[PDB]
Amino acid sequence: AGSHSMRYFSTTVSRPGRGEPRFIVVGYVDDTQFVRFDSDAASPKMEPRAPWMEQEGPEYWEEQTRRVKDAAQTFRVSLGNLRGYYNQSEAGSHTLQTMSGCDLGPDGRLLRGYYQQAYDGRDYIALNEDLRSWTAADEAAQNTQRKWEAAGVAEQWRAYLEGECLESLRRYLENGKETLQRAEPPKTHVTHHPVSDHEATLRCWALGFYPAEITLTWQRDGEDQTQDTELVETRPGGDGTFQKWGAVVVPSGEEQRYTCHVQHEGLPEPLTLRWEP
Amino acid sequence: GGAIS
Amino acid sequence: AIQRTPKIQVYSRHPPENGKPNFLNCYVSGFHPSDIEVDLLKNGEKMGKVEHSDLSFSKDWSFYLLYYTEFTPNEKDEYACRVNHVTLSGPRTVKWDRDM
Ligand SMILES: *C(=O)CCCCCCCCCCCCC
Ligand SMILES: [Cl-]
Ligand SMILES: [Zn+2]
Ligand SMILES: [Zn+2]
Ligand SMILES: [Zn+2]
Ligand SMILES: [Zn+2]
């Protein structure tokens, strides 16, 4: 594909009276998970979660583990500071989430770099697209913004996101190319289930596709039936692929007025389906 | 990295 | 703090056929905070050998998890996923619909 992404998603969750906050990190290339870390594991280390990662040598895993353990400590201290900023009790559990990563564009350059944090499920602070400034989501976060501006934190992220982030992504894309670079088109079909003598559910299926981005719409007389379509969230097959369906309930006598349209980057051109008894 | 909030 | 209620989908990896080995999936998404309880049920009873994905989250910071286990569907057996989360009045149970 012309563009690719790498992301790390970390979750830190405090548990007052029950030890250190738990720390979980997962990394993704596009929609494929490739590593994990869990501080509650027997002997916490960064671990592969895609087979093409297993060829990285031990020094790779040692450095990633060092960096994650570093982050874990930073984020535990951060949880303490944030409970201060927010005047909160030491008795309650709180959650710090971070996202970071890079999009590689077809010109081989950084399409966009990211670093953002959330506290208890809400935006807290984000690195702006320019990789030189911050958006604080509230007054508490302005504490952080001020500290980070003074410490030149943005420039450190800019260097990472334009350099090592992209270099790493390029390497993973090469090491995993046979699966990461293969867009698998959805297998599609329509099912039909009478709900009465007079109406039926037409369900449009898309199965086994990669990546997860897809558009599935029902149309009648060339117009989207979005407000009559039940559309489920795109969901994992469990085998690295994704699934989705969309359904409409229609009068039996007008079943052939309905067509399902599917768009996927793995498709030469959009598909058009219909109920075919 | 080391950037505490 | 925000709270969001879990969405739940129960489904098989491959189209189900009686007597053929498959995978039973319960995909739980859009929830916050992250603590959550998920059980796969066979005829009302908890299945063993249930695995789950590593905790991740979406653009809106809401979490998602896939719970899954091997199964061989037959007409006699009923399957379901039961989810408990702080945002719920009580556990939500979603039956597997094998004919979609
Ligand atoms: C400080 O906030 C630590 C953030 C980690 C920067 C990414 C370094 C590259 C290795 C991936 C580790 C991801 C840990 C969340
Ligand atoms: Cl740790
Ligand atoms: Zn590509
Ligand atoms: Zn070493
Ligand atoms: Zn049916
Ligand atoms: Zn577990």
Numbering used by the authors:
A (entry chain A): 0 to 276
B (entry chain C): 2 to 6
C (entry chain B): 0 to 99
Report text from the authors:
In the present study, we show that the classical MHC class I-encoded protein Mamu-B*098 captures C14nef5 and interacts with specific TCRs, thereby supporting the recognition of C14nef5 by 2N5.1 T cells. The capacity of the Mamu-B*098 protein to function as a lipopeptide Ag-presenting molecule is further substantiated by a high-resolution X-ray crystallographic analysis of the trimeric complex of B*098 heavy chains, β2-microglobulin (β2m) and C14nef5. The rhesus macaque CD8+ CTL line 2N5.1 specifically recognizes the N-myristoylated 5-mer peptide (C14-Gly-Gly-Ala-Ile-Ser; C14nef5) derived from the SIV Nef protein. The present study has provided functional and structural evidence to show that MHC class I molecules have evolved to include those that bind N-myristoylated short peptides and present them to specific CTLs.
We determined the crystal structure of the Mamu-B*098:C14nef5 complex at a resolution of 1.76 Å. The overall structure of Mamu-B*098 was almost indistinguishable from that of other MHC class I molecules, which were characterized by two semisymmetrical domains, α1 and α2, which formed a β-sheet platform topped by two semiparallel α-helices. Continuous electron density corresponding to C14nef5 was observed in the Ag-binding groove, thus providing direct evidence for the capacity of Mamu-B*098 to bind the lipopeptide Ag. The myristoyl group and C-terminal serine residue (Ser5) were buried deeply in the groove and interacted primarily with the B pocket and F pocket, respectively, forcing the central three residues of the peptide chain, in particular Gly2 and Ile4, to protrude out of the groove and into the solvent. The acyl chain of C14nef5 did not gain access to the A pocket and was packed in a U-shaped configuration in the B pocket, which was lined with an array of hydrophobic or non-charged amino acid residues, including Tyr7, Phe22, Val24, Met45, Gln63, Val67, Ala70 and Phe74. Besides its hydrophobic properties and low electrostatic potential, the Mamu-B*098 B pocket was also marked by its ample cavity (250 Å3), which was roughly 1.5-fold larger than that of the corresponding B pockets of other known MHC class I molecules. The side chains of His9, Lys70 and Tyr99 of HLA-B27, as well as those of Tyr9, Lys97 and Tyr99 of Mamu-B*17, protruded into the cavity; however, the amino acid residues at these positions (Ser9, Ala70, Thr97 and Ser99) were all small in Mamu-B*098, allowing the folded myristoyl group to fit in the B pocket. The myristoyl group made a sharp U-turn instead of extending into the A pocket, thereby leaving the A pocket unoccupied, and the view from the A pocket towards the B pocket pointed to a highly constricted conduit between the two pockets. Furthermore, the salt bridge that was established between Arg66 and Glu163 overhung the channel, making the opening as narrow as 4 × 4 Å2, a size that hardly allowed any peptide chains to pass through.
